[PDB]
């Protein structure tokens, strides 16, 4: 969140994303031998319910960015000002 709230600091954000990807890969490797009622699955869901707020913020961040990617070329934003490159006064962007 702190790195997305500003620009010129995308490298640290990408590295943190890679670290989170490796962490969830480790979680998947932990779960890859589970049963429907596995003890490891119970431990992981308990860890999730202990860290509910953090994973909630992460999922909200991802939802925001995926919905932005979907909306930028959904109804009228891709042909709003088709003269040159993307030229948006950001007021119409906020309104839309």
């Amino acid at each position: 969140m702190k790195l997305s709230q500003d620009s010129s600091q995308i490298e640290l954000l990408k590295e943190l994303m890679d670290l989170q990807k490796d962490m969830v890969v480790m979680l998947l490797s932990m779960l890859e031998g589970n049963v429907v009622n596995g003890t490891i699955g119970k431990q992981m869901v308990d860890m999730l319910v202990e860290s509910s707020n953090n994973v909630e913020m992460i999922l909200k961040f991802f939802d925001m960015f995926l919905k932005l990617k979907d909306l930028t070329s959904s109804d009228t934003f891709k042909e709003y000002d088709p003269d040159g490159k993307g030229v948006i006064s950001k007021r119409d962007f906020h309104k839309a």
Side-chain angles (χ1 to χ4, degrees):
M1 272 200 55
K2 287 182 55 58
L3 268 290
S4 45
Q5 277 184 159
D6 61 72
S7 164
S8 166
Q9 298 175 3
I10 53 182
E11 308 300 87
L12 225 63
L13 186 60
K14 292 181 184 303
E15 296 180 304
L16 196 81
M17 290 297 104
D18 296 2
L19 182 57
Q20 180 183 359
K21 171 179 171 57
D22 297 14
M23 184 193 68
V24 299
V25 159
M26 182 200 67
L27 299 182
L28 287 171
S29 279
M30 283 290 300
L31 264 180
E32 79 174 15
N34 206 36
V35 199
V36 276
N37 293 332
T39 61
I40 305 179
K42 288 186 295 183
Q43 296 299 327
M44 197 158 302
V45 71
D46 291 332
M47 170 261 295
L48 288 182
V49 86
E50 294 309 304
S51 87
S52 316
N53 188 270
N54 321 326
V55 64
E56 274 176 3
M57 303 173 84
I58 294 177
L59 291 177
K60 286 173 185 177
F61 178 88
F62 290 162
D63 281 3
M64 294 166 207
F65 274 54
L66 292 176
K67 288 177 181 180
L68 169 143
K69 173 60 186 60
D70 204 333
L71 198 141
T72 188
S73 316
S74 158
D75 49 326
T76 177
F77 192 78
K78 59 184 183 304
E79 74 276 39
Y80 207 92
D81 299 326
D83 58 334
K85 54 99 179 182
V87 275
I88 312 297
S89 159
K90 310 187 189 212
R91 298 302 304 271
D92 41 0
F93 192 19
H94 172 51
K95 177 252 300 177

